């Protein structure tokens, strides 16, 4: 496995002109102390879409060099243009990332036949483990269990981050791909049911604010302490759903700032929460002892 | 709990003019021997919709009287007409059923406000535990976790059969309703993830053909043997999905007949499978050692 | 055609113990004066689901006998049980209905293969024109354009009431079935686009309150006065959507009573509107000069 | 209006290393001869996603300079990064484009509140008419009629290309935004119903192969000859749906090559059609006299 347990999809802290490197360094050290199992850098939660190429590269290399082999670092390097996914993947490989988080194409989309060629062209280009990221609610596109079955034979493709939110489809991947594909939950509110079907962890938004809970929930579940794990899941559910009340990472960045972490403003087209949803977030942060 | 583990949604075996009572008796004794935990009689799997009132009553009373207190018997008694759900519920109560399986209205539908009045009017009429049955893919209507939270305070309403297929919504019910509402999975391909979130069993189509597997999967999971339970789930997944290749109970009745159980023909508007889907079913029955 | 233009899906006015026959008579005469083209009696808008068999029969025969050949009368006679759809269809035929409104099965559902057998078994039983009613948001089930193509060859099956709300699917039916199947819009907010694709009218909820507008919108469109028709559609759109703010016929019965028509209470599981939605309805009724 | 009638979403013809400028010139002259009303350059149909920035700029400027004021030219300039949508929009403005086709954010997405800030930040930057492009099946994101109502007050925002495929939502935009927002259909199979609700044309994939049909269908409809327009729509429907059998522009580029137009290969992650779908396309091309 690239890692087991809690891999945080870390926000990118912005100053008003670029990236807050010192704040990022603080977050990285906090994650390592708090027992986060891995860092996913410049995923969707990290707003990679509104970062320039230079910012994405500086940011990914910074996380890699700061962590310095202490825990695994995974970079989001996929895009909806296959040539660009190739170039970025080779580049993060070349500077020592331990894994690649590679989203399906989105918006342009393609067929199941094109998904196979897409991911084979990216994988062929590198020698670094790859995690396929499926998130149909964002991309308009669903990579099926059959397409995944065909891809899991690839040498670098070892895992999927599964954010379809469709548990029947999760069971199908596991039954079909067996021990040739690790499953990571792509939704925090679904850690328990996914680890229960044989998943080995989560790439997590909620770990941004409670890394201990997300790590222990996985560790407990994987160790056979399924009830102790279930209770963390149920107790944090209302907070977790509050973090999805508006497009992520709007709520999780909002929350970090309410918890005095000073992580800056979102970049357009993301923006400040509306007032009613802000109040629902705060209520859940206070009930969970976070402010 | 009304029961824990595997509650079979038993087919109703039809002769060419009415109900095959002798065949039903054989099925009941087989279920008790095979360690099925409870019988759900005249649910959707039992084709209650195409049975006359007299047939529904004769059938339910027969299952109750044959079982004779050996295991719990639950009757489907709900409909999309509240007066009719009342009369049928009182009637199954009066002849000694142990639970009521009461579907949300369907087709006519109603609001969340009407769902509360619907279920309160049914419950008020009886003194028998009630299981609310939510199946939005069939009814057009989704009873939300908030509406369920309000209903679980009712004296008779103790459980939900949850066939939304939405695991996020299952977590929400459990986090919100806590120990005031038992959750039964309404989908066989989702037993593991639902028991994992605190569910206490399944009202099952797949138990019609492999009652031992469905019972042991639940017993194992609930007892902490989560891996042994997971393996039954994954091994039977392809068969289970084959049983949903056409509108249930078309495939499960088709399969029982292929396994030489002689359970008769479906009633219109259900009908014989098409040929390609029939072959996919057979392949999965043979691979699972069922024919 | 069974009729062209506006066929009202008439509410059934209830007294506190049964049916308000005098009120129904008043509504029928009002519809004929107001130039409504046809009456659909005991459809979903007429709450047939919560009427007893005797009430459904008394109600349908009353509308037929009161209208006395002045305009076409269509009865809803389908159900999700094929035997019961047969018996009811023959019965409305026998007392002189001019058309049958026959919904797809719902809740139990079936395959496309079963839909063909379902509708052939109903049609074979009668010699009265049949309108197939497709409403997947209520039934869970979508009859496809290909299945409709196969059925339109049937002698009695001449039309579809299309409430999928999917305009691409409406075009497909017309291109495929051609002049062998009349299309009626099953949504008032979609009269224009459906008549534009070759539809010949609407089976209407909004005609309950403004029969003149619904009739003229169709007459104008069919006569080539497409702009005059469009304006009625756009001006009444906000009222029309307000009539769907809660499960129909909750809002249209609520509105009739606000317009002093004294049509009684809904039957469970339908119930009174909630307050915020009630206010939105009233605002739209006042802006459209209805109260 | 920026234009009325048929605005072709022109493919970009690729050589094996870049763009086939001579082929594009031929296509442009053919469109002008064939009476196409406007050219949309580097939209989704033009595979802008897999073109470099230099290619996108060279391509857009080429179409603008070749057309040389003969008909309106609209460039796709939006992206899911607001800064990048700003820079590209200003740039196409600066070289004389007549309109901007600006998609909602996709994949990253945002709230309705962010959509307003997104589009205001793009518009504020320019003085060129803007067409908002809504395509939730591709972006994961639906701009609502209320958000559009608020934006149509903007000085540059004059239109929407509406590809939700939801005709109820089209009526809502028109009723709400009135004469402050032109509607273009974003689906060829929905030209009739959208022009019928007050739309003024289509930004079209099907115009790539039959520009005369798409132009005449609009001209006829807008001129009151609604039946003559309807017939073009119904006759071409099966071809049109065939063009959507796989992710556009896979089928339309495939078809152009079958019609001997020599427009080159698709760029990854788009790829060649599968065989069964290829045969369905060919059958429809032959039945429509195109090969
Ligand atoms: Cl997308
Ligand atoms: Cl799910
Ligand atoms: Cl239903
Ligand atoms: Cl639609
Ligand atoms: Na692999
Ligand atoms: Na209770
Ligand atoms: Na016919
Ligand atoms: Na404007």
A144 and B CB contact within 8 Å: no
Of the ligands numbered here, which is closest to the C-alpha atom of C179?
7
| Residue D208 to residues C128, C263, D7, D11, D162, Cα–Cα distance (Å) | 47, 56, 10, 7, 19
Phi, psi (5° rounding) for residue B5? 90, -130
What is d(CA A179, CA D238) in angstroms, rounded to the nearest whole number?
A: 44
Which residues of chain C does B269 touch, with a Cβ-Cβ cutoff of 8 Å? 80-82, 105, 108, 110, 114-115, 117-118
- The residues, ordered by sequence, that sit 6+ positions from C94 with a Cβ below 8 Å of its Cβ are none
Ligand 4 centroid to D276 CA: how many Å? 28
What is d(CA A70, CA A61) in angstroms, rounded to the nearest whole number?
A: 15
Task: Specify whether C161 is catalytic.
Answer: yes
From the list B49, B117, B247, the residue facing C111 with the nearest CB is B247
E strand or H helix at C187: none
Q: Which long-range contacts (CB under 8 A, 24 or more apart) does C13-22 make?
A: C13/C263, C13/C264, C14/C47, C14/C263, C14/C264, C14/C265, C14/C266, C14/C267, C15/C264, C16/C264, C16/C265, C18/C55, C19/C51, C19/C55, C19/C58, C19/C59, C20/C263, C20/C264, C21/C62
**Which pair of structure tokens corresponds to residue A169?**
């489809």
C113 and B CB contact within 8 Å: yes
From the list C171, C190, C195, the residue facing D189 with the nearest CB is C171
Of the ligands numbered here, which is closest to the C-alpha atom of A169?
2
C220-243 burial by CB neighbour count: b if 16+ within 10 A, else e? Answer: bbbeeebeebbebbbebbbbbbbb
Ligand 6 centroid to A189 CA: how many Å? 26
Ligand 7 centroid to C160 CA: how many Å? 11
Q: What is the 3-state secondary structure (H, E, C) of chain D?
A: CCCCEEEEECCCCECCCCECHHHHHHHHHHHHHCCCCEEEECCHHHCHHHCCHHHHHHHHHHHHHHHCCCCCEEEECCCCCHHHHHHHHHHHHHCCCCEEEEECCCCCCCCHHHHHHHHHHHHHCCCCCEEEEECHHHHCCCCCHHHHHHHCCCCCEEEEEECCCCHHHHHHHHHHHHHHCEEEECCHHHHHHHHHCCCCEEEECHHHCCHHHHHHHHHHHHCCCHHHHHHHHHHCHHHHHHCCCCCCCHHHHHHHHHCCCCCCCCCCCCCCCCHHHHHHHHHHHHHCCCC
Extract the runs of DSSP E, i.e. beta strands, from chain C: 5-9, 38-41, 73-76, 99-103, 130-134, 157-162, 182-185, 201-204
CA angle D166, D167, D172 (to 5 degrees): 100
E strand or H helix at A75: strand A73-76
DSSP state of A19: B
Sign of CA pseudo-dihedral A276, A277, A280, A281: negative
A189 and B CB contact within 8 Å: yes
From the list D106, D114, D271, the residue facing A107 with the nearest CB is D106
| Residue C10 to residues B80, C18, C86, D115, Cα–Cα distance (Å) | 20, 16, 23, 42
D150 and A CB contact within 8 Å: no
The reply, when asked if residue C184 is annotated as ligand binding, is no
Question: Are D234 and C174 within 8 A, CB to CB?
Answer: yes
| Residue D98 to residues D3, D44, D67, D71, D264, Cα–Cα distance (Å) | 10, 18, 11, 9, 28
What is d(CA D15, CA A179) in angstroms, rounded to the nearest whole number?
A: 42
Which residues partner with B159 through β-bridges?
B131, B182
The DSSP result for B115-129, as a single string, is: HHHHHHHHHHT--S-
Neighbours of ion ligand 2 (CB under 5 A): A 166-167; B 166-167
From the list D171, D187, D237, the residue facing C189 with the nearest CB is D171
**Which pair of structure tokens corresponds to residue D265?**
């290969």
Neighbouring C-alpha atoms within 13 Å toward the C-beta of B23: 16
The reply, when asked if residue D44 is annotated as ligand binding, is yes
Q: Is A25 helix (H, G, I), strand (E, B) or coil?
A: helix
Which residues of chain D does C174 touch, with a Cβ-Cβ cutoff of 8 Å? 234
C165 and D CB contact within 8 Å: yes
What is d(CA C140, CA B106) in angstroms, rounded to the nearest whole number?
A: 9
Question: Are B106 and C267 within 8 A, CB to CB?
Answer: no
Which residues partner with D100 through β-bridges?
D75, D130
Question: Determination method here?
Answer: X-ray
Residue among A16, A86, A107, A186 with most chain D CBs within 10 A, to mutate: A107
Neighbouring C-alpha atoms within 13 Å toward the C-beta of A223: 11
Inter-axis angle of helices B226-235 and B211-222, nearest 10: 150
**Which pair of structure tokens corresponds to residue B79?**
């409909």
What is d(CA C174, CA D217) in angstroms, rounded to the nearest whole number?
A: 17
The reply, when asked if residue D184 is annotated as ligand binding, is no
What is d(CA C130, CA D162) in angstroms, rounded to the nearest whole number?
A: 36
Of the ligands numbered here, which is closest to the C-alpha atom of C155?
7
- The residues, ordered by sequence, that sit 6+ positions from B202 with a Cβ below 8 Å of its Cβ are B5, B6, B7, B184, B185, B186, B188, B191, B194, B195, B214, B218
C17 and B CB contact within 8 Å: no
A281 and D CB contact within 8 Å: no
The chains found to touch A (3+ Cβ pairs under 8 angstroms) are B, D
Extract the runs of DSSP E, i.e. beta strands, from B65-192: 73-76, 99-103, 130-134, 157-162, 182-185
Q: What is the CATH number of the domain that holds A136?
A: 3.20.20.70
What is d(CA A129, CA B226) in angstroms, rounded to the nearest whole number?
A: 29
Question: Are B271 and C113 within 8 A, CB to CB?
Answer: yes
Counting Cβ atoms within 10 Å, is residue C137 exposed (0-12), middle (13-18) or buried (19+)? middle
Chains A and C touch (3+ CB pairs under 8 A): no
Closest CA relative to residue D97, chosen from D134, D153, D47, D59: D59
Distance from the Cα of residue C85 to its chain's centroid: 17
| Residue A86 to residues A117, A121, A125, C236, D272, Cα–Cα distance (Å) | 12, 7, 6, 54, 20
Residue written as tokens 């302490």?
A: A225
CA distance D287 to chain A (A): 26
What is d(CA D97, CA B196) in angstroms, rounded to the nearest whole number?
A: 58
What is d(CA C7, CA C14) in angstroms, rounded to the nearest whole number?
A: 21
Q: Of how many residues is chain B composed?
A: 291
From the list D165, D172, D192, the residue facing C197 with the nearest CB is D192
D222 and C CB contact within 8 Å: no
Question: Are D175 and C226 within 8 A, CB to CB?
Answer: no
**Which pair of structure tokens corresponds to residue A101?**
């988080």
Beta-strand relationship, B157-162 and B130-134: parallel
E strand or H helix at A250: helix A250-258
Catalytic residues of D: 133, 161
B175 and A CB contact within 8 Å: yes
Check: CB of residue C172 under 8 Å from CB of residue C134: no
| Residue D108 to residues A76, A88, A140, B168, Cα–Cα distance (Å) | 13, 19, 12, 22
Ligand 7 centroid to C131 CA: how many Å? 10
Which residues of chain B does A175 touch, with a Cβ-Cβ cutoff of 8 Å? 234-235, 237-238
CA distance D225 to chain A (A): 36
The reply, when asked if residue C4 is annotated as ligand binding, is no
**Which pair of structure tokens corresponds to residue B39?**
């019988």
| Residue A262 to residues A16, A23, A46, A253, Cα–Cα distance (Å) | 12, 8, 15, 9
- The residues, ordered by sequence, that sit 6+ positions from A57 with a Cβ below 8 Å of its Cβ are A91
Ligand 1 centroid to D236 CA: how many Å? 29
Resolution in A: 2.2
What is d(CA B36, CA D65) in angstroms, rounded to the nearest whole number?
A: 77
B87 and C CB contact within 8 Å: no
D50 and A CB contact within 8 Å: yes
Check: CB of residue D155 under 8 Å from CB of residue D122: no
- The residues, ordered by sequence, that sit 6+ positions from B121 with a Cβ below 8 Å of its Cβ are B82, B86, C268
What is d(CA A186, CA A258) in angstroms, rounded to the nearest whole number?
A: 25
What is d(CA A65, CA A58) in angstroms, rounded to the nearest whole number?
A: 10
Provide the domain count of chain B: 1
Ligand 7 centroid to C2 CA: how many Å? 12
Which residues of chain D does A16 touch, with a Cβ-Cβ cutoff of 8 Å? none
CA distance D195 to chain C (A): 9
From the list A81, A268, A272, the residue facing D121 with the nearest CB is A268
Ligand 1 centroid to A140 CA: how many Å? 6
DSSP state of C206: G
Closest CA relative to residue C82, chosen from C42, C120, C52: C120
Question: Are D138 and A140 within 8 A, CB to CB?
Answer: yes
Check: CB of residue A106 under 8 Å from CB of residue D107: yes
What is d(CA A241, CA A139) in angstroms, rounded to the nearest whole number?
A: 21
What is d(CA C14, CA C253) in angstroms, rounded to the nearest whole number?
A: 11
Return binding residues of A for pyruvate. 45, 203
- The residues, ordered by sequence, that sit 6+ positions from D20 with a Cβ below 8 Å of its Cβ are D13, D14, D263, D264
Of the ligands numbered here, which is closest to the C-alpha atom of C132?
7
Q: Which domain holds residue C219?
A: 1-291
Closest CA relative to residue C207, chosen from C16, C43, C17, C2: C43
Ligand 4 centroid to D168 CA: how many Å? 6
């Amino acid at each position: 496995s690239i890692f087991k347990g809690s891999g945080v999809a870390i926000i990118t802290p912005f100053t008003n002109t670029g990236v807050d490197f010192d704040k990022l360094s603080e977050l990285i050290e906090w994650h390592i102390k708090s027992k986060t199992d891995a860092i996913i850098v410049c995923g969707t939660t990290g707003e990679a879409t509104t970062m320039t190429e230079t910012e994405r590269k500086e940011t990914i290399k910074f996380v890699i060099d700061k962590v310095n082999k202490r825990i695994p670092v995974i970079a989001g390097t996929g895009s909806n243009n296959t040539a660009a996914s190739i170039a970025m993947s080779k580049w993060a490989e070349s500077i020592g990332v331990d894994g690649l988080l590679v989203i399906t194409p989105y918006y342009n989309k393609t067929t199941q036949k094109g998904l196979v060629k897409h991911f084979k062209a990216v994988s062929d280009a590198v020698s670094t483990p790859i995690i396929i990221y499926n998130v149909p609610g964002r991309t308009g596109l669903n990579i099926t269990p059959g397409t995944l079955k065909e891809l899991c034979e690839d040498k670098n493709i070892v895992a999927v981050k599964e954010a379809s939110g469709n548990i029947s489809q999760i069971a199908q991947i596991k039954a079909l791909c067996g021990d040739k594909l690790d499953i990571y939950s792509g939704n925090d509110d679904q850690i328990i049911p996914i680890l229960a079907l044989g998943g080995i962890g989560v790439i997590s938004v909620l770990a941004n604010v409670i890394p201990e809970d997300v790590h222990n929930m996985c560790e407990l579940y994987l160790n056979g302490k399924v009830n102790e794990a279930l209770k963390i899941q149920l107790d944090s559910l209302a907070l977790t759903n509050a973090l999805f009340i508006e497009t992520n990472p709007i709520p999780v960045k909002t929350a970090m700032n309410l918890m005095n972490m000073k992580v800056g403003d979102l970049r357009l087209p993301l923006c400040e929460m509306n007032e009613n949803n802000l109040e629902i977030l705060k209520k859940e942060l206070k009930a969970y002892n976070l402010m």
